Write a protein that binds this DNA or RNA. Structure first.
Lengths: 112, 117, 137, 52, 101
RNA sequence: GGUGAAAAGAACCCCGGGAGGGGAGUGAAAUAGAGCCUGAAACCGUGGGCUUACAAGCAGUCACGGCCCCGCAAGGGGUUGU
RNA sequence: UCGGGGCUUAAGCCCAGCGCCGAAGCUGCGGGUCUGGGGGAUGACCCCAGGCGGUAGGGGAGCGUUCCCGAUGCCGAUGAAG
C-alpha cells in the first residue's frame, strides 16, 4: 500500500521549501530523517515534521513496516497568498506576497 | 432582456486553444498569442500545398537526371526524346522507374536516343 | 507515393588533383559529396560518396589567381581581418584551398557539416589505404 | 523603476533554465565509532562525544 | 506486372491486383471499370505512341467516399481579412484485378 | 451572497506545541469538510511518453525518418531529427 | 566579398540555333458557390458555358447568445444547465 500525509496552509514560501522536498525523493525513509536532520534550511523543519507524520500513518493505519519504507514521491503545492502592504519612498506602496505551501509526502514498502 | 456573455466567449476561445496544441510556450497556452500563430499557419499550409507540388517536380527530376546520366544523356535531352519518340508515358512522379525495374528505364532510354537523332 | 530509400553503404572515391582545375574539381567533388549522381537520391538523409583527394597541393588555377586570389578570414577583434592569398596557402597547408572551395559549394546547414567529414583531402599523394578507394576520373 | 529595467517578461523556460544549479547538495555524513548514529565529518555530535 | 495507368488527371503504377484510391469517377457503387488508359507493362512495353493500341487494366469500384476535411485559412495582416474554409476532396475506391494486355 | 435533505459540523485513535493531516464515522454525494455547490483560464507543481548539449530564431509549416501509442488490417495520434 | 564558392578557347562578351528547368498563369481531373442558357407540365433535379485577390465601402444569406408566444405542454434522478 501507499501512505500519504499533507501539511496544508504552511506559512512558508513554496519555491523555498520546494528544494528541501526534492532533496529527499525516493530515499530510504530512515535516510531522509538523516538527510534533513543535518540539512541547512528553514524548510527542513517542515518537510521533516510532515515526513515523521508520513511514516506515522504508514505504520499506524496502513500496517506497513517502518524498517523498510521510502519516500515514494513528495511534492509541495502553492497555497493561497498572504499579501501585506509595504510603505516605500515617495508614497509608493508595494503589495508583498507572504506565500504558503501545501507540503505532501507519500511512502511505500521497500520491495517484494 | 439583458444578454450576458456566459458560455460563448470561453467556448470560442478554447475552441481555438485546441488548434494550438504543440505550439511553443505562450503560443499554446495564451489565447491571444495562439491565434496569430494560427493565422500564420493557415497561410503557411495554403502556400505550402502550392509548394508540395514543386517540392516533388524537383526530387523526381533530380533522380531522373542522375539516373539517365548513368546511361549517357542529359535530363533535357531525356525529355526531348520522350516527346519526340512520343512516349508521354513517364509522368515525372512515376519516373522513379530509375530505381525499380531499371531494365524498364533502359528501354525508355534507347527509346529517347535512337528515336531522337 | 515516391520511393524513400533505406540504409546505405558509403563509397569512398580515390580522386587525383594533379592538373585538375580548382572549381571544376571543386564542383564534381561536391556534387558527389551528396548523391546528386545517385538516382537513389534523397536530399536530407546524407549518403554522398566519401570524396578522397590526393596530391591536392597540385591544383592549377586560372589567370593570376595564385598571386591574386585572396582568402579572407575575420576573427572578433578589430583589424582581425587576416588577408591570405593562394601563394601563401599553397606553400603552407595546400590541401586547404580545395577545401574551402568545396565546403563553400555545399548545402549550408546541419547535414552540410555532415557533408564535410566525408571530404578527405591530402597532400602526397598517399592516404589511409583503409578499405575502400574506388579510383574515379 | 529608474533606468535599467527588463525589456521582456522572462520566458518560463528561461526562468526554470536559470534555476539549473539551484539544487542543494545534501549534507555529508558518516557513521561514528562511539554510536551507530550519523555525524558530519570533523564534528562532535550528541549521542556520542570523543576522547580528550 | 507493372502497368502505368493514367486516371483522374494522374498516372499510377499497378500490380496484378492492388488497392488504390483515384479521382472520383461516375461509376456504379460496385461495378467494374476498365482503364484502357495504360502505359508500359511488366514484360517490356514502351508506349511507342502515347497509349498502347491494344491493352487494358481492369479495376473494380470498391465504393466511393468523401475525404478528410482539410482547412484553407486565408489571412492577410494589417487589414481584417480572415477566410475560414473547409474542403473535403471526394474520391472513389478502385480495387485492381486484371491487367490483361 | 451558496456546505447539507438534515450539523448528521467529523467521537475516539494516530503524527504534531499548534496549524495541519491519516484511519474510523456521518452523508446518496466529503474531489458537498466549513468562505465548503458548480470549479473555467492564466499561474504554480509531481509522474510518465517523445525530444535537445556544432546548434542561427515571429518558433510555425510542407516533406520523410526514428521512437512511443490506440488498431485483426489499412490507418489514427503524440513527439520531432533532417 | 560579383548573393557566396568559384569561374579565363569560360560558369565573361557578342552573334547563331537546339533542348530543358522554371509562378498560385495555361492544361488534366475532381469539388465549392454564383450569373446565363436548355430539358424537366414536373417542383425536384440534370446537364452545358462562364465569373469568384481585395482596404474604405455598398449588397445578400446564415450562426450563436438573452428573453416571449408555443407552456396547465414536452426532456429531466435511469440525471437538467454548466
Amino acid at each position: 500500500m501507499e501512505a500519504k500525509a499533507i501539511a496544508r496552509y504552511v506559512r512558508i514560501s513554496p519555491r523555498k521549501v520546494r528544494l528541501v522536498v526534492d532533496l529527499i525523493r525516493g530515499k530510504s525513509l530512515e535516510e531522509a530523517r538523516n538527510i534533513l536532520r543535518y540539512t541547512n534550511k528553514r524548510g527542513a523543519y517542515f518537510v521533516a515534521k510532515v515526513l515523521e507524520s508520513a511514516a506515522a500513518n504508514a505504520v499506524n493505519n496502513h500496517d506497513m513496516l517502518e524498517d523498510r519504507l521510502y519516500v515514494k514521491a513528495a511534492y509541495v503545492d502553492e497555497g493561497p497568498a498572504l499579501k501585506r502592504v509595504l510603505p516605500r519612498a515617495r508614497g509608493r506602496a508595494d503589495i508583498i506576497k507572504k506565500r504558503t505551501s501545501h507540503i505532501t509526502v507519500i511512502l511505500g514498502e521497500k520491495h517484494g | 432582456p439583458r444578454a450576458k456573455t456566459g458560455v460563448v466567449r470561453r467556448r470560442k476561445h478554447k475552441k481555438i486553444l485546441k488548434l494550438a496544441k504543440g505550439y511553443w510556450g505562450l503560443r499554446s497556452k495564451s489565447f491571444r498569442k495562439a491565434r496569430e500563430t494560427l493565422f500564420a499557419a493557415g497561410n503557411y499550409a495554403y502556400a505550402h500545398r502550392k509548394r508540395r507540388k514543386r517540392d516533388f517536380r524537383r526530387l523526381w527530376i533530380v533522380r531522373i537526371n542522375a539516373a539517365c546520366r548513368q546511361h549517357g544523356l542529359n535530363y533535357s535531352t531525356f525529355i526531348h526524346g520522350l516527346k519526340k519518340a512520343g512516349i508521354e508515358v513517364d509522368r515525372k512522379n512515376l519516373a522513379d522507374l530509375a530505381v525499380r525495374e531499371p531494365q524498364v528505364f533502359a528501354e525508355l532510354v534507347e527509346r529517347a536516343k535512337a528515336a531522337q537523332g | 507515393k515516391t520511393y524513400v530509400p533505406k540504409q546505405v553503404e558509403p563509397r569512398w572515391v580515390l580522386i587525383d588533383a594533379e592538373g585538375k582545375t580548382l572549381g571544376r574539381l571543386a564542383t564534381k567533388i561536391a556534387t558527389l559529396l551528396r548523391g546528386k549522381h545517385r538516382p537513389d537520391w534523397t536530399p536530407n538523409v546524407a549518403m554522398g560518396d566519401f570524396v578522397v583527394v590526393v596530391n591536392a597541393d597540385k591544383i592549377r588555377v586560372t589567370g593570376k589567381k595564385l598571386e591574386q586570389k585572396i582568402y579572407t578570414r575575420y576573427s572578433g577583434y578589430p583589424g582581425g581581418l587576416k588577408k591570405i592569398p593562394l601563394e601563401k596557402m599553397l606553400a603552407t597547408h595546400p590541401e586547404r584551398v580545395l577545401e574551402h572551395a568545396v565546403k563553400g559549394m555545399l548545402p549550408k546547414g546541419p547535414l552540410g557539416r555532415r557533408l564535410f567529414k566525408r571530404l578527405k583531402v591530402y597532400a602526397g599523394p598517399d592516404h589511409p589505404h583503409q578499405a575502400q578507394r574506388p579510383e574515379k576520373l | 523603476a529608474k533606468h535599467p529595467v527588463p525589456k521582456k517578461k522572462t520566458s518560463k523556460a528561461r526562468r526554470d533554465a536559470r534555476r539549473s544549479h539551484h539544487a542543494l547538495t545534501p549534507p555529508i555524513l558518516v557513521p561514528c565509532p562511539e554510536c551507530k548514529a550519523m555525524k558530519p565529518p570533523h564534528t562532535v555530535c550528541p549521542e556520542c562525544g570523543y576522547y580528550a | 506486372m507493372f502497368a502505368i495507368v493514367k486516371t483522374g488527371g494522374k498516372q499510377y503504377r499497378v500490380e496484378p491486383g492492388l488497392k488504390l484510391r483515384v479521382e472520383k469517377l461516375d461509376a456504379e457503387p460496385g461495378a467494374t471499370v476498365e482503364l484502357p488508359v495504360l502505359l508500359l507493362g511488366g514484360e517490356k512495353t514502351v508506349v511507342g505512341t502515347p497509349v498502347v493500341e491494344g491493352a487494358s487494366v481492369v479495376a473494380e469500384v470498391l465504393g466511393h467516399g468523401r475525404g478528410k476535411k482539410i482547412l484553407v485559412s486565408k489571412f492577410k495582416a494589417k487589414v481584417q481579412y480572415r477566410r475560414k474554409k473547409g474542403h473535403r476532396q471526394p474520391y472513389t475506391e478502385l480495387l485492381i484485378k486484371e491487367i490483361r494486355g
